[PDB]
Amino acid sequence: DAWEIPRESLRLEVKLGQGCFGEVWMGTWNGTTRVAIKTLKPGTMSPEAFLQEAQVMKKLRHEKLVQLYAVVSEEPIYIVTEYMSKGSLLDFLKGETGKYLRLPQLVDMAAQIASGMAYVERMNYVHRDLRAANILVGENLVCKVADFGFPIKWTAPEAALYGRFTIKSDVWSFGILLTELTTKGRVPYPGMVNREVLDQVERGYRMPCPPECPESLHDLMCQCWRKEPEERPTFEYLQAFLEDYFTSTEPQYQPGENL
Ligand SMILES: Cc1ccc(C(=O)Nc2ccc(CN3CCN(C)CC3)c(C(F)(F)F)c2)cc1C#Cc1cnc2cccnn12
C-alpha cells in the first residue's frame, strides 16, 4: 500500500475538471495542506485500468513532473497530487495574462517542460500525449508535465499510423507544443481537419514560422518534425538549447508587439 490514505484526511471543495472517465477537485489534505484530486466516476473504468496511473506516478519523482501524494484504494477512488494554481497551460495562455507573455517567458516555460521530459527520457518512458492540455502551471510560471489519463495534430505520423510511440514521438509533439506557446494557445494546423493534417504532413508539410517567432526557433520545431525519429533531437539537447537561447542563439532579440 505505502501511499494509501483515508477519506478522513481529504475534502473535495471546487470541481475544476470533467474528464473522459472522471473529475478533478481543488481541496485540503489533513485539514492543512492544499492539494488536487482525481475522482473516478464509478462503473466506467474500474480499479484495474484507472489505478495503473498511480503505479506509473509512484516511480517518477521530479521537480517538473506533477507529484503524486497519496491514493485511496477503497471506492470511490481519489488519486491525490500537488496543486498547480494557474491550471493547464492552454488555459493560462488563452487567459488574462497570455497577452503579456513575451518570448523570454514562453522559452523559459518551454525549457522546464523539456527538463521534465528529459527526466522522462532518462527513465526509458514514453508520455504519448504531450501537449499544452497536459501541462499544469503554478505561481511564478512554474510548469510541470502532467497527464489527464485521438490527437492527430500533436501525434507523430509514425505513432499515429503504425503505433511506434517512442520518446522521439514525444520529441515530435514538443515541437507542436512549442507552436502553441508561440501562437498563445492556438490550435495546430489552422483550418485543417484531422484527415488533411496526416495527408499534407505525410507529404512533407510542416507549419510555417509563426509571425514574430524568429527563424532560429522555427528551425528547432522542424528539427522535432523530421520524418526519421532517430534524427529528431533529444530533450536534454532541447533543454540546453532553450536554457541558453538568448545568449547563444538570439542575443539581439528585441521584444515587439506580441513576442
Ligand atoms: C489531480 C491530478 C491527478 C492526476 C494527474 C496525473 O494523472 N498526472 C500524471 C499521470 C501520468 C503521468 C505519466 N504517464 C504518462 C502516460 N505514459 C504512457 C506513462 C506515464 C504523469 C507525469 F507526471 F509523468 F507526466 C502525470 C494530474 C492531476 C492534476 C492536477 C491539477 C493540479 N492543479 C490543477 C489545476 C487545474 C487542473 N488540474 N490541476
Residue numbers in the entry: 261 to 409, 427 to 536
Please, what does the article write about this entry?
c-Src belongs to the Src family of kinases (SFKs) composed of 11 structurally similar non-receptor protein tyrosine kinases: Src, Fyn, Lyn, Yes, Blk, Lck, Hck, Fgr, Srm, Brk and Yrk8, all of which share a conserved arrangement of four different functional domains, named Src homology (SH) domains as well as a regulatory c-terminal sequence. In the current paradigm, phosphorylation at Tyr 530 by c-terminal Src kinase (CSK) plays an inhibitory role, while Tyr 419 phosphorylation on the activation loop plays an activating one, although neither of these sites exert full positive or negative regulatory control. Here we show that c-terminal Tyr 530 is a de facto c-Src autophosphorylation site with slow time-resolution kinetics and a strong intermolecular component.
We solved the crystal structure of a c-Src KD construct (aa 252–536) in complex with Ponatinib at 2.49 Å resolution. The crystal had two molecules of c-Src in the asymmetric unit, and in both chains, the electron density for Ponatinib was perfectly defined with full occupancy. Ponatinib binds to the active site in an extended pose reaching the back and allosteric pockets causing the activation loop to adopt a DFG-out conformation. The imidazopyridazine core of Ponatinib rested on the adenine pocket of the enzyme and formed hydrophobic interactions with residues located within and at the vicinity of the hinge L276 (β1), L396 (β6) and Y343 (hinge), forming one hydrogen bond with main chain nitrogen of M344 (hinge). The methyl piperazine group formed an electrostatic interaction with D407 (A-loop) and one hydrogen bond with R388 (HRD motif), inducing altogether a DFG-out conformation. The interface is composed of the αI-I′-helix (residues 512–526) of the substrate molecule facing toward the αD (residues 349–354) and αF-αG loop (residues 460–471) of the enzyme-acting molecule with a total surface area of ∼1900 Å2. A close-up of the interface showed that two acidic residues, D521 and E520 (αI), form a salt bridge with R463 (αF-αG loop). In this scenario, both molecules adopted a disposition such that we can visualize the c-Src c-terminal Tyr 530 of the substrate molecule positioned for ready entry into the active site of the enzyme to undergo intermolecular phosphorylation.
